[PDB]
Amino acid sequence: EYYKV
Amino acid sequence: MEKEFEQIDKSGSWAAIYQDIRHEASDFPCRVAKLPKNKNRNRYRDVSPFDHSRIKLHQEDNDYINASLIKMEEAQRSYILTQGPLPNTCGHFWEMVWEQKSRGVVMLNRVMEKGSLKCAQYWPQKEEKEMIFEDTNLKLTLISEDIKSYYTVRQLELENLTTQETREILHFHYTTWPAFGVPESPASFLNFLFKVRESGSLSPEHGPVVVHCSAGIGRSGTFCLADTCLLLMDKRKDPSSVDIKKVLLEMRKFRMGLIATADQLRFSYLAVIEGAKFIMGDSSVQDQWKELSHEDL
């Protein structure tokens, strides 16, 4: 749910 | 312009250049996006629209949608970049399309990608099973469909149930572009872009085209950067006068994070280089792209 995953 | 590309490729500096852009990129506040009543309207918690360029729904309840107006003054084109709609924002998405008078939607993701849900099924897949968005008084009906090997164009009818006005929306769905990845070839990308261009959906008499992927910054950024660069080349009437890096920084004044990997930036160069041929006068390279795209079967 973080774009930078 | 190929000089600058041939050098970076030999020197292997693409990741350094991409990091340079991240460092220099604008940083504007996103207060409306971070309000608690808007937590369920954001797909990712580290991707938000800037307050100054966000699209506002014409709504008294809550005017928020995770979408940004990217207005390229010099290239004379506007884009709306947005996240792939959520189950609860499909009505807002089409409210936005209607209120901004968009004629085209470009979708660069798939609803399910490598396992995870990236997007809600926000448009109808069967003529006889139309969608009604009661919260926003809209109705959406699939009219026809043009399926190609790596993309599909659908004709949709958007009806404002209040006034019974109807509009035709063209949906361009690119199905073979992975998250954090690039298109198969510049030919298949440019063939897709020129299909969008040919449709008239980007004409200035229409509202801004809506472009989305998963977050609305990565693949969406690549698409809009290439189109604007080719626009600038034609308008200035000088190919190698366009600095891809400065154009991307200009776009990132309007939405954070545009272009998500260094390889997507490399591809953007590759696509503008290949597209320059058409701008320079070789109008027939367009039919070439169609052939290398394998769009049939």
Residue numbers in the entry:
A (entry chain B): 2006 to 2010
B (entry chain A): 3 to 299
The authors write:
Protein Tyrosine Phosphatase 1B (PTP1B) is the prototypical protein tyrosine phosphatase and plays an essential role in the regulation of several kinase-driven signalling pathways. Here we identify PTP1B as an inhibitor of IL-6 and show that, in vitro, it can dephosphorylate all four members of the JAK family. Dephosphorylation of substrate is initiated by nucleophilic attack by the active-site cysteine (Cys215) to form a phosphoenzyme intermediate followed by hydrolysis of the cysteinyl-phosphate to release free phosphate. Asp181 acts as both a proton donor, enabling protonation of the tyrosyl leaving group, and as a proton acceptor, receiving a proton from the water molecule that hydrolyzes the phosphoenzyme intermediate.
To determine the substrate-bound form of the D181A/Q262A double mutant we used the bisphosphorylated activation loop sequence of all four members of the JAK family as substrate peptides. Incorporation of the D181A/Q262A mutations leads to a five order-of-magnitude reduction in catalytic activity compared to WT PTP1B20. Nevertheless, in multiple co-substrate structures of this mutant, we observed that both steps of the reaction had occurred; dephosphorylation of the pTyr, presumably via the usual cysteinyl phosphate intermediate, as well as hydrolysis of that cysteinyl-phosphate. Surprisingly, the products of the phosphatase reaction (both the phosphate and the tyrosyl-peptide) were clearly visible in the active site in all four structures. The phosphate was not present as a cysteinyl-phosphate intermediate nor as the pTyr substrate but rather as free phosphate. This suggests that dephosphorylation had occurred within the crystal, as well as subsequent hydrolysis of the phosphoenzyme intermediate, but that neither the phosphate nor the tyrosyl-peptide product had completely diffused out of the active site. Accommodating both of these species within the active site necessitates a reorientation of both the tyrosine (back and across, towards solvent) and the phosphate (towards Q266, where it has displaced the water molecule W1 that Q266 coordinates) compared to previous structures. The occupancy of the phosphate was refined as ~60% suggesting that a proportion of it had left the active site but that the majority still remained. Our structure suggests that incorporation of the D181A/Q262A mutations have corrupted the usual catalytic cycle in which substrate is released prior to hydrolysis of the cysteine phosphate. In some of the JAK activation loop structures with the D181A/Q262A double mutant the register of the peptide in the active site is possibly scrambled, with populations of both the first and second tyrosines being present in the active site.
